[PDB]
UniProtKB/Swiss-Prot annotation, chain A:
Protein name per UniProt: Chaperonin GroEL
Included range, full protein: 184 to 366 of 548
PTM notes: Phosphorylated reversibly during heat shock. Can be UMPylated on a tyrosine residue by SelO/YdiU, probably under stress conditions.
Gene: groEL
SUBUNIT field: Forms a cylinder of 14 subunits composed of two heptameric rings stacked back-to-back. Interacts with the co-chaperonin GroES. Can form asymmetrical complexes, composed of one GroEL and one GroES, and symmetrical complexes, formed between one GroEL and two GroES oligomers. The asymmetrical complex is the functional unit. It was suggested that the symmetric heterooligomer may represent a transient intermediate in the chaperonin protein folding cycle.
Domain commentary: Each subunit is composed of an apical domain that binds non-folded proteins and GroES, an intermediate domain and an equatorial domain that binds ATP and is involved in inter-ring interactions. Forms a large central channel that appears to traverse the entire length of the cylinder with no obstruction. The central channel of GroEL functions as two cavities, one in each ring, that are separated from each other by the crystallographically disordered 23-amino-acid C-terminal segments of the seven subunits. The entry and exit of polypeptide seem to be restricted to the apical end of each ring. Modulating the volume of the GroEL central cavity affects folding speed in accordance with confinement theory. Small proteins fold more rapidly as the size of the cage is gradually reduced to a point where restriction in space slows folding dramatically. For larger proteins, either expanding or reducing cage volume decelerate folding. A stepwise reduction in cage size results in a gradual loss of cell viability.
Organism: Escherichia coli (strain K12)
Family that this chain belongs to: Belongs to the chaperonin (HSP60) family.
Record's function text: Together with its co-chaperonin GroES, plays an essential role in assisting protein folding. The GroEL-GroES system forms a nano-cage that allows encapsulation of the non-native substrate proteins and provides a physical environment optimized to promote and accelerate protein folding, probably by preventing aggregation and by entropically destabilizing folding intermediates. Also plays a role in coupling between replication of the F plasmid and cell division of the cell.
UniProtKB/Swiss-Prot annotation, chains B, C, D, E:
Keyword set includes Amino-acid biosynthesis: no
GO cellular component, one term: cytosol
Gene Ontology molecular function, alphabetical: ATP binding; identical protein binding; metal ion binding; protein folding chaperone; protein-folding chaperone binding; unfolded protein binding
Record-given protein name: Co-chaperonin GroES
Source taxon at top rank: Bacteria
Family recorded in the similarity comment: Belongs to the GroES chaperonin family.
Biological source species: Escherichia coli (strain K12)
Taxonomic lineage from the root: Bacteria, Pseudomonadati, Pseudomonadota, Gammaproteobacteria, Enterobacterales
Known regulation of activity: Activity of the GroEL-GroES chaperonin complex requires Mg-ATP.
Complex formation: Heptamer of 7 subunits arranged in a ring. Interacts with the chaperonin GroEL. Can form asymmetrical complexes, composed of one GroEL and one GroES, and symmetrical complexes, formed between one GroEL and two GroES oligomers. The asymmetrical complex is the functional unit. It was suggested that the symmetric heterooligomer may represent a transient intermediate in the chaperonin protein folding cycle. Another study shows that the symmetric heterooligomers are substantially populated only in the presence of proteins that cannot be folded by the chaperonin.
Keywords, ordered alphabetically: Chaperone, Cytoplasm
InterPro entries according to UniProt: Chaperonin_GroES, Chaperonin_GroES_sf, Chaprnonin_Cpn10_CS, GroES-like_sf
Protein function: Together with the chaperonin GroEL, plays an essential role in assisting protein folding. The GroEL-GroES system forms a nano-cage that allows encapsulation of the non-native substrate proteins and provides a physical environment optimized to promote and accelerate protein folding, probably by preventing aggregation and by entropically destabilizing folding intermediates. GroES binds to the apical surface of the GroEL ring, thereby capping the opening of the GroEL channel. Regulates the ATPase activity of GroEL.
Residue ranges the record marks as coiled coil: none
PTM-bearing positions, type N6-succinyllysine: 33
Length: 183, 96, 96, 96, 96
């Protein structure tokens, strides 16, 4: 039979970076209720850069989801230990897309969630990131393959402006595959 | 008992920090070896070129910040780890 | 409190310059680590070969220009960064 | 004001030679950094092993020929470049 | 008989530990060479620059913890292995 699968809001094909992040073992999916959103445009391997953000999140008490280029090594390990220890309910996922296009999706998620992307080019580093820098969303669901952000707490006007900008780029686009990607 | 010679000092290394300032648990390379340790034993003192002996400024039982390197040696006494290092390797002493 | 030993000095590094002379903001490698810092603690003094102790020419609370290198060690006191380095590593003292 | 410590000397480097003897303009690697500079500040003097202090033979305001190397450090005072180097790095003093 | 010269010391190395604390047998690289040994012979003493001779702080027949390195030499006396090393290589002396 022909089936129809409709996914609303934002959902990108990037699963959790560790199976230990799963909050709900019976479904195998991390479920974060009203979590902070940390959008990093650089690969993360140590915890020193991300430490103050973790302290601020733990003080707030809300969960955290880190959309990053890549989390691995010591930083992933300590995030895992902190997840089980209950100090911070934190999940880490890879940033969707590739070079010159991954940044676009990161900015889209930042606009949707009302956050800011951390990168070397923009100017600020992960050490100086604060709670206001982090994005906000009502719900976050991570599975083995896809991550969904439900009801991101972002300004509607900014979302519409970014959508209009992407539409303008689509009008400027001259490739079917590219225009489908921005669609 | 272990008695260090000349300016050497026997120091028990402090435990590795397993938590951050706000409660973040550090694991692996994040929880590096501590550079501070309490002094377990003090030698007689460094011998100068004139033959005199000058007592070390480090006392027994104080917390000192030292520098790890080739001059620091590891030893096992009462199946616990201690470090033997010269008084020059100790940068400072923690007070209060 | 931290008391440095012999000629070692505890210095808090000054903040990195985030702006140029005319208002240009420097980021990344442009805003390098400052080589100047205020002196937080002064040791008793360098011990000479005759056994005497000569007080260091650096006082507590003055801005000094020093040289970063292997002889300078990094430490964390009151979860703030400080540097322990010998008095020879300090090139000069900033006056007025 | 900057006061160098011990035998260190603060020297402002002379301008690079932009012309040859007969008027040929040198550019790039041809106009190398000058090894001569006027002395801006003189330290108290080198400390000997006996505890005494010997004043440096370099005075304030004389042109000295020095050697660039690892012992020479670069600093910025009144947004102008100066060099801090030991008195041993100074080969000679230009007179008249 | 072997008489070491100046500050050199003849020490017989202790046997390698073939068992752990609770009875686990260590073999190969697990049972490393012991850094402790009893002193077999003590030299006259280190000669200072003034011509005097200062007796070594190590006595004959005490257990000392030393450091293996280039300064330690291996020798065979009464077809048994001994080590000749300077008194500076000995970190400490085991008491009781």
């Amino acid at each position: 039979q022909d089936e129809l699968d409709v996914v609303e809001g934002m959902q990108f094909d990037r699963g959790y970076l560790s199976p230990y992040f799963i909050n709900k073992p019976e479904t195998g999916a991390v479920e974060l209720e009203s979590p902070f959103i940390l959008l990093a445009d650089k690969k993360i391997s140590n915890i020193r850069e991300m430490l103050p953000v973790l302290e601020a999140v733990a003080k707030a008490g809300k969960p955290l989801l880190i959309i990053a280029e890549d989390v691995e090594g010591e930083a992933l390990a300590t995030l895992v230990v902190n997840t089980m220890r209950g100090i911070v309910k934190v999940a880490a996922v890879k940033a969707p897309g590739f070079g010159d296009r991954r940044k676009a999706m990161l900015q889209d998620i930042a606009t949707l969630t009302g956050g800011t992307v951390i990168s070397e080019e923009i100017g600020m580093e992960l050490e100086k990131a604060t709670l206001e820098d982090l994005g906000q969303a009502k719900r976050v669901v991570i599975n083995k393959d896809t991550t969904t952000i439900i009801d991101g707490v972002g300004e509607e006007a900014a979302i519409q402006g970014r959508v209009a900008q992407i539409r303008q780029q689509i009008e400027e686009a001259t490739s079917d595959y590219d225009r489908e990607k921005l669609q | 008992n272990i008695r260090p010679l000349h300016d050497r000092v026997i120091v028990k290394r402090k435990e590795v920090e397993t938590k951050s300032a706000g409660g973040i648990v550090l694991t692996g390379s994040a929880a590096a070896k501590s550079t501070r340790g309490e002094v377990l034993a003090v030698g007689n003192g460094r011998i100068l070129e004139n033959g005199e002996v000058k007592p070390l400024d480090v006392k027994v039982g104080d917390i000192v910040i030292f520098n790890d390197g080739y001059g620091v040696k590891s030893e096992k006494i009462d199946n616990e780890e201690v470090l033997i290092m010269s008084e020059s390797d100790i940068l400072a002493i923690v007070e209060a």
